[model samples]
Target: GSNKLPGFATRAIHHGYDPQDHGGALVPPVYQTATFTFPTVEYGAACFAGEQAGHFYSRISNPTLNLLEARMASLEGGEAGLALASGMGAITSTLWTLLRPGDEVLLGNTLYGHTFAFLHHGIGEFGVKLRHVDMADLQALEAAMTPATRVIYFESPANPNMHMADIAGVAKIARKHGATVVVDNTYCTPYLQRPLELGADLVVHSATKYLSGHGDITAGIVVGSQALVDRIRLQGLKDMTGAVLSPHDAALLMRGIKTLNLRMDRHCANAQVLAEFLARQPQVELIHYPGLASFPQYTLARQQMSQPGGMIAFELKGGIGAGRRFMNALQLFSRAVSLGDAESLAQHPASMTHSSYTPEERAHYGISEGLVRLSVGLEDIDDLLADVQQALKASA
Candidate 1:
């Protein structure tokens, strides 16, 4: 509401909230109740009829959750935002709002395993035809488009693989075919990249990861034009999916977002250092990281993202056996799934995050047994380097 809103960090700490509106409490108090009391039948009916702005039920909205949504919308430069129970809920609800029976969607091949499963199984069974494509290949993407194609979904700095997609380029192509572009901005976060500014119709996040900055909460958000988000909120979230986020989790997310810029800077720096270290190891075969100069799409990544991000994918020279040894040898880096946390984490995609895919499918997607995905955290660089070096030596 102010003409001069300072900068990103300033807005993150101050926007979408007023202490005067909430008993002078600097922090947003969680409105944990399920439903709000109505003063009159007329006011209640007006809220339900969408003629007024007021929280009626936790499932639809809450003061705490609304604050989170408003803050995220401002951060992402979107007209509105909706917080969901989980990232999958955000993805599903957004797509469900846009897609109908017989509609088709073009999806990126390298996505989070669960997202792939949903597209391949859940959405597939719903009669929506899905096609997986290399989003980096503009020609191939254009080739995949058809009359039935209604949505083009992709992840930038794609999950586990670190494959960067050209957001503006894909958005341009989608417009020609009258298809809506939905980008999974989880990896990049709004601090690293803003997809809506690049012409994307909507942006989704697994707020459980980077936005939370801690591995404690599971949440998701979708941001876009108010009209589109309202459709997801009313039709998809309220009437169908019903996966609403709690106000307590919303407060945690709000706190997490306040330090997002600071955490992301450290994450980017640590990842860059670690990727360089891995490339020099004799036991390492290949590394995938946008921060690396050797990355094939480094130019595109620089053009699209403000930062290279912390996720890294690399292969070991000794394959699956070496990967196991490396993971086992690590001390500081936790042997677990999930990324963008304060602590470093490592996991093998073939048998862990992406195990749901069949062996044939994994190979097709270039997920080899030796492939290891590392979530470079905010740990001390020397400590991370030491652990990785020892693990590589042990594996070798």
Candidate 2:
């Protein structure tokens, strides 16, 4: 008999599960029960004391969430994974585990607005030194390092800006300073990019986005070495945050991941076409998409990502008024806040996602008033192009 690991798509569907283990069911059954019974008092005590591995409480572990964690870990090539209630839960929990009161963290300047706020407000208040810097500049990154620097965190294809940092480059710099490297792989999911393989110590995801392509569930995940993940599970998830993911949401995320490869292919293709279409438009002053050679970090993106993701950021010729007009005129694209849904979404980041930042802060991060972020969906190319074309004309 041949014994070989399955390919990416096959692993996505079949990893961490066996139908025979679940009463021969073809699909994974959601174990909705809040707790599991032990065989005896001795067994229950052993489970609680960590001498044995079994699911005694849903808060600590569940069959559905376990399957999701295992599957995500396998997809990311990480030794273990933890699922949380939301993207912020994943980020905060991970940081909570990694940072001590006196520790320092280096962050990318163009992170999602809330992430910036969390570091500044949440962790900064805890006595953690947080420094925001240009991640693309190795000199800036090196200069920002201190003896207390414990973590270097950043996002690839950073939100609303579409700027990319060289994963390997940053990892190398972090390693020199003995700091852990954490990458936000939300924009480019494991289907398009695997950060652990690029020297990241941990990979975090907003599973609310591409991982659950349908946008029906909100969740987050972190994949890393078993030792680190276990520490986070006990310290952050179990005792501190208690931001446990529901079994139903876990089931939905698992189902969504099965088609991740197929959906990503379509998402990438449509985004590439739409980026090209927007580039040729006179009303479009700038388009920020890695697929285009005109993108400043195109070379870095090609080296690190398998495909440029579906997210695009562009500026209209007219200012904020023009952006509002364009979004209002769109018929096919939804004027929503979140990204990576099956439906096309368009939003003005300065007012929506990044509104938490003041106008001065937004300007510092290159988030201009006219900038519009688009999460391209798996729609007919001609129809999407037509809709955008009409919207631009109306805006003008």
Candidate 3:
């Protein structure tokens, strides 16, 4: 080899583990264990005091997880990576690690239901002040920032609604305000977009979603500079949430990520077809998909994401009633909550994914009551189209 850096797919398939170190085994084995015994009393003391580097505890770090973390860091273009129990585990730990009693958080108007609930109801109890505003509007975002604002968080291509925020613009404001910029990169996994490269201080992901490529496991990951990842690992994850990932799950995630580029290719193609078909419907009041030519901020999507993504959000003129009927009628696309799986899913955000938000909050955030979110899958394009066709007819 002439020493050229490997491309994304090549790196994903070959980066993390070295076969020579593992008796030439092609696949890395899961080092399943709770703790590692120190070599001696002196070694134990040195390890505890951070003078030595080794895995003494699984909660802190494990060999298998470290491999996954290394792989993810390479793929995501960050210096370090930390795996967590769930998306909330990663988000909560990050907030807990970064915030003090009087520190402030400026969050986006629309977010995942659970994240919204925590910041709205739980974080306030911890004495952390919060300001919720529309981050896409640079003016509103700037106005919401205060001297106490220590963190600025948002989901680009926001959950359920598909609103695209300007990541670099937000990062610019965060720098001016001396705030850490964190982006929920779940919607556009590192396969499609890398937030850290776009001026973000940190990037979080629901590894349960696209990163895992299947619905068999639950996990999350955070990527950033080594110092912040170490902080999140030592304090946020270890002392606060204690949401460490299982070695088996880490192996599964590694397996999934190995094929991330392949999966993403089919995902984007499938979503493009669905978005176009839905756009032709007369009953469709509004659709939120980056692939659509009429989508607001289409330019931002072009600049920010390599693909249109695999999710779509739309509303029907018949309102929630029609949404319910359409979901009930779908045969191939099952009514389900989560996204980025092999099987297609349909969910009503008002009652399912986003019920945590009050009606007033939803209205204020521009999410209509009748909105239906679709998680397009890897199924044949014609078969998926038939399901939506009949669902539309049944709804009528």
Query: Candidate 2: how many backbone clashes?
Result: 0
How many clashes in each candidate?
A: 0, 0, 0
| Per-candidate TM-score against the hidden true structure | 0.96, 0.96, 0.96
TM-score of 2: 0.96
Candidate 3 residue pairs in backbone clash: none
Residue pairs with colliding backbones in model 2 are: none
Ranking by lDDT: 2, 1, 3
Q: Write the per-residue lDDT of candidate 1 for residues 291-346, one digit (tens) a residue.
A: 78889999999999898999888989976678878888999999898888999999
Which digits, one per residue and each the tens of the lDDT, describe model 3 over residues 1-396?
867778999889888778999999999988889889976899899988889888779999899999888888898899999999999999999988999889999888788989988898888688999888888899999998889999999998887678888899999988887999999999889988888998999999999999999989999999999999999999999999999899999899999998999998998999899989998897788887898878887999999999999998888878667887888888999889899998898998666656787656666656787799899999999999999988888888
Where does candidate 1 clash, by residue pair? none
Give the Å error, residue 302, model 2: 0.5
Specify the poorest-scoring 10-residue window by lDDT in model 2.
357-366
- Quick one: RMSD of model 2? 1.8
RMSD of each: 1.9, 1.8, 1.9
Candidate lDDT values, in order: 0.89, 0.89, 0.89
Q: After superposition, how far is residue 362 of candidate 2 from its true place, in Å?
A: 3.0
